[PDB]
Amino acid sequence: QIVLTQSPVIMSASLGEEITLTCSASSSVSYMHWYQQKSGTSPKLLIYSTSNLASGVPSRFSGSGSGTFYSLTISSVEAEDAADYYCHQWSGFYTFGGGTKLEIQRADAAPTVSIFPPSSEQLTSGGASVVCFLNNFYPKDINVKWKIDGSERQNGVLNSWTDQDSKDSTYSMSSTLTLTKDEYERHNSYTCEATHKTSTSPIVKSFNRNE
Amino acid sequence: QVQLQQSGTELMKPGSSVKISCKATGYRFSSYWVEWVKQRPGHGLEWIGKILPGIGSTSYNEKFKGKATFTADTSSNTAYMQLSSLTSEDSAVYYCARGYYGPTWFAYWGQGTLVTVSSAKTTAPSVYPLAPVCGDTTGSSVTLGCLVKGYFPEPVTLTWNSGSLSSGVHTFPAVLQSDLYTLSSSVTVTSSTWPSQSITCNVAHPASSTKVDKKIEPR
């Protein structure tokens, strides 16, 4: 029943900088353990018993702490350190912190936009999805706006962001606008506009159905 | 050496039960407690409880008493967790894990088992090729895509050219709408290699025994 609080929930770290993730306990803890969870993987032990480095873990990871406050330090942050990190202790039973995401602050990067009309296969089924990929941008927030014959369309849009890339620290996102075949044949110009921190100018791709 | 191998993805209806297995190899099964951990998409990690194979001693997190039941079979070195009276709150990835003696650290983890609790029915995906707009393509590279629509439950797997094409790929996490998932993937390659060489997206949805290949053809 010792509650572990990790703040901030998201920690930004520049490449090559030292960063310290922390864990505060609602009462004194004997030893803290730490795990890394990279996208799509199981938690992996990094540090056990407050400061012992788990086998195979790079020496750029270290741990310290005492009482109600514990720390996981990365001496020189690298792109592959993009991950969630959790602290863990036992007092009567085990509790975990809520986790901190280490977000790698690489150089700002504009998105590369690609647009795709409905496949013939889908059209045969009476559906029409238009897909827009916004690839390799940073930071993560990005706006996508769909226009049909020049007017914004908001309903029928499904967006999905990737997790931060372990090599280049970028994000990508996919936006799918799903229409009926009839709705799709009702109009001609299909445009996706990406607005990102890197510019007030939208990054655009378009096609015309009748072409 | 030490490995914890968990059973596969589950989909079960509300009110029912699921039994997840954790097969331990590489060490003396009865020497260490098998821990169980719950992870929902945004609630961090939660300790459910533990069982000591052999004697069969169990310890439960109060929060999970009457939800989880542990058993262990020393003849097969397998531990089990049964989750009963399922609700959507039980949808999560569940891990088994293992440490050393007494209160300990979790040195070994299973690969996790996804459990979806839903009344929605299993549905095979439709897979659509995403070929570039007619005409030429910007520069000396081309981006192709694959759209995977109308399936339930998770997961699907998606690869390109049976895994031979792995660079320049982005696969976007599935999003749920009206009890069906949509997933997509992009791949970027040099114009010199497509369409002169074939590029095909390979999609599997085990829950429906689906295995589909869609070759991306030029428009």
Q: For residue B122, which amino acid is it?
A: T
Q: For residue B169, which amino acid is it?
A: V
Ordered by where they begin, the domains of chain B are 1-119 (2.60.40.10), 120-219 (2.60.40.10)
Length of chain A: 211
Burial class of residue B64, CB neighbours in 10 A (0-12, 13-18, 19+): middle
DSSP chain B: --EEEE---EEE-TT--EEEEEEEESS-GGGSPEEEEEE-TTS-EEEEEEEETTTTEEEE-GGGBTTEEEEEETTTTEEEEEE-S--GGG-EEEEEEE-SSSS----EE---EEEEE-SSPPBPPEEEEEPPPSS--STTEEEEEEEEEEEBSS--EEEEGGGTB-TTEEEEEEEEETTEEEEEEEEEEETTTTTTS--EEEEEEGGGTEEEEEE----
> Any CB–CB contact under 8 A between B188 and chain A?
yes
Burial class of residue B33, CB neighbours in 10 A (0-12, 13-18, 19+): buried
Instruction: Please tell me the distance from the alpha carbon of residue A177 to that of residue B147, in angstroms, as a whole number.
Output: 12
> Any CB–CB contact under 8 A between A159 and chain B?
yes
| Residue A79, both tokens | 């792109």
Is A103 annotated in some ligand binding site?
A: no
- Taking CA–CA distances from A175, the nearest residue in chain B reads B184
Nearest to A58 by CA among A87, A33, A89, A36: A36
The CATH number of the structural domain formed by A107-209 is: 2.60.40.10
Q: For residue B212, which amino acid is it?
A: V
> Any CB–CB contact under 8 A between A171 and chain B?
no
Q: Do domains A1-106 and A107-209 have the same CATH topology?
A: yes
H or E stretch covering A123: helix A120-124
Question: A78-82 contacts: CB < 8 A, separation 24 or more?
Answer: A78/A15, A79/A15, A79/A104, A79/A106, A79/A165, A79/A166, A79/A167, A79/A168, A79/A169, A80/A38, A80/A166, A80/A167, A81/A13, A82/A38, A82/A39, A82/A163, A82/A164, A82/A165, A82/A166, A82/A169
Location of structure tokens 């795990």: A35
Is A165 annotated in some ligand binding site?
A: yes
Resolution to 1 decimal place, in Å:
1.6
Instruction: Please tell me the distance from the alpha carbon of residue B158 to that of residue B171, in angstroms, as a whole number.
Output: 8
Instruction: Please tell me the distance from the alpha carbon of residue A33 to that of residue A35, in angstroms, as a whole number.
Output: 7
Instruction: Please tell me the distance from the alpha carbon of residue B176 to that of residue B166, in angstroms, as a whole number.
Output: 26
| Residue B10, both tokens | 């589950």
- Return the DSSP state at A52: E
Cross-chain residue pair B45–A133, CB shorter than 8 Å: no
Is A88 annotated in some ligand binding site?
A: no
Instruction: Please tell me the distance from the alpha carbon of residue A140 to that of residue A159, in angstroms, as a whole number.
Output: 13
Tell me the domain boundaries of chain A. Answer: 1-106, 107-209
The CATH number of the structural domain formed by A1-106 is: 2.60.40.10
